[PDB]
């Protein structure tokens, strides 16, 4: 028995919401039971050693089905404490390739408080990070250095310098920039930090660069984190999915020990969180990210070049920042989620955005977020410094308008046009990209 509609989940249970496309002829009730069995105890034939145990203590149970959605509860004792790797091995380890299902998507997961307490959460967190930066009351500005690849270390840091001194709070290595023949990491780390210190002294505002420590082995990533800390960098960056959760946990621990804030890039996520019929919804990945401990994670822009739904993104931001998030069908939140006092994570909106998107971005995210302008900074007609100024001014003008009681969506264009009267850099950015829109 693995389907039990009379079972009442416990506050210690781990809960999953699966969208199941069963093999033809496999009814939903039986497919859900099969997922529960293969993700907990079940086998394919009777075994003598099963009689030496009490499997009822470890069975997962599908306790509710609506349409093609199955709710499954897993006992707390099934999982290794503090190991996202173990969660994945059980919950998404084999049931996605099972014959009786044609497609399967994990939509949401209720992490019980008793399991959350075995995780440390972010090493810094939004509040402490804002304290370390001395930045309060507005979204924070960032941007990826472009070209993605091909710049020398010294020229790479020139672009960093122009961005930061122009008003960006941070800049970052592209997810695929690690250590390559045209740009080795030690060279980049040194030159970048010279630029960071220079821009900080000239502007009077604290700066940072998200130095990518992503590498082929955990040991190499830790080495690069050590060097970043020796240079006094406030930040490092890791592609936590391509590097993987086990090495990600190792880097997060070291980051806290060294006092480094940890930016997390979700490279590879769209391989399996995009299609509505198969994979793992990003909101689940976001929960796992906050549990292990990232200080930021990309969440999408909704309005940019990469796909992302506004309602789902609103729920994901709440999952990353709040201590309790109630269920909300309109946003795809299947469960109430208590965060057991874990620190919150900065959502990061990046990808194909420019000044005209700032009213939308402020409306969606509020103050606690990073807005990244890569092409939207370096692509400014007069280069990276002017572009950074345009983006910083647009963000501050919209924040001011909102705080004064204005509807920044209804008056979004008007607000930007007002600010542009005192900021030629913003005026030039608005003219260049005025006709660059993506589908929402």
């Amino acid at each position: 028995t693995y389907y039990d509609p009379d079972y009442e989940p416990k506050d210690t249970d781990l809960l999953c919401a699966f969208r199941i496309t069963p093999k033809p002829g496999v009814p939903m009730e039986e497919a859900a039971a099969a997922v529960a069995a293969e993700s907990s105890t079940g086998t394919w034939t009777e075994v003598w050693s099963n009689l030496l145990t009490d499997l009822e203590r470890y069975k997962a149970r599908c306790y509710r089905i609506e349409g093609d959605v199955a709710y499954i509860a897993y006992p707390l004792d099934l999982f290794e404490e503090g190991s996202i790797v173990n969660i994945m091995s059980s919950i998404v380890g084999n049931v996605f390739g099972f014959k009786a299902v044609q497609a399967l998507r994990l939509e949401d997961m209720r992490i019980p408080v008793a399991y959350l307490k075995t995780f440390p959460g972010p090493p810094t967190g939004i509040q402490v990070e804002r304290d370390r930066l001395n930045k309060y009351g507005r979204p924070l500005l960032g941007g990826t250095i472009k070209p993605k690849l091909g710049l020398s270390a010294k020229e790479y840091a020139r672009v960093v310098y122009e961005c930061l001194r122009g008003g960006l709070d941070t800049t970052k290595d592209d997810e695929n920039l690690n250590s390559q023949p045209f740009n080795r990491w030690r060279d980049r780390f040194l030159y970048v930090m010279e630029a960071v210190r220079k821009a900080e002294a000239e502007t009077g505002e604290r700066k940072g660069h998200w130095l990518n420590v992503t590498a082929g082995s955990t040991e190499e990533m830790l080495k690069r984190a050590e060097f970043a800390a020796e240079l006094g960098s406030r930040y490092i960056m890791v592609d936590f999915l391509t590097a993987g959760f086990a090495a990600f946990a190792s880097v997060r621990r070291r980051a806290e020990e060294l006092g480094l804030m940890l930016h997390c890039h979700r490279a590879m996520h769209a391989v399996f969180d995009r299609q509505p019929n198969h994979g793992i919804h990003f909101r689940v990945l976001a929960k796992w990210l906050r549990m292990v401990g990232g200080d930021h994670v990309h969440t999408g822009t909704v309005v940019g070049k990469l796909e992302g739904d506004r309602a789902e993104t609103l729920g994901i931001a709440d999952l990353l920042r709040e201590d309790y998030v109630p269920a909300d069908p309109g946003r795809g939140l299947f469960f109430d989620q208590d965060w057991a006092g874990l620190k919150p994570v900065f959502p990061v909106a990046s990808g194909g955005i420019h000044v005209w998107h700032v009213p939308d971005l402020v409306s969606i995210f509020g103050d606690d977020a990073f807005f990244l302008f890569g092409g939207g900074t370096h692509g400014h007609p007069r280069g990276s410094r002017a572009g950074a100024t345009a983006n910083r001014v647009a963000v501050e003008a919209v924040v001011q308008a909102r705080n004064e009681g204005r509807d920044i969506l209804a008056e979004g264009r008007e607000i930007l046009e007002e600010a542009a009267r005192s900021c030629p850099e913003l005026r030039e950015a608005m003219e260049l990209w005025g006709d660059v829109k993506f589908e929402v």
């Binding site: 091909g150 710049l151 020398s152 010294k154 020229e155 840091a157 020139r158 310098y161 122009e162 045209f182 030159y191 010279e194 630029a195 220079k198 007069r382 280069g383 410094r385």
Partner: protein, 99 residues
């Protein structure tokens, strides 16, 4: 204080500077203009005057920007740079004006 290449020769005239710019362009490199009031061993990022002149077709166009930078920043050192994007590195840098 010296400023690296050509700083041990007499200060360059505008016609000498122009010939260096012609050398940069003739070889297909990108001329640029930077300036600072704090030259020295600890400064590896002078201020950009506009961007590197990727679109400049004649040395005189660069020389006009030099005169405009010189007029705008009379109390700064001003240098001409030449960048080789195939090499990903500067192939020539020299101070054109001293305060």
């Amino acid at each position: 204080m010296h400023t690296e290449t050509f700083s041990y020769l007499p200060p360059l005239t505008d016609e000498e500077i122009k010939k260096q710019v012609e050398y940069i362009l003739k070889n297909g490199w990108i001329p640029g203009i930077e300036y600072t009031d704090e030259p020295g061993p600890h400064n590896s990022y002078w201020s950009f005057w506009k961007l590197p002149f990727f679109n400049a077709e004649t040395a005189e166009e660069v020389m006009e920007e030099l005169e405009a930078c010189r007029e705008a920043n009379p109390d700064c050192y001003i240098k001409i740079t030449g960048y080789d994007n195939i090499r990903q590195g500067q192939v020539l840098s020299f101070v054109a004006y001293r305060p």
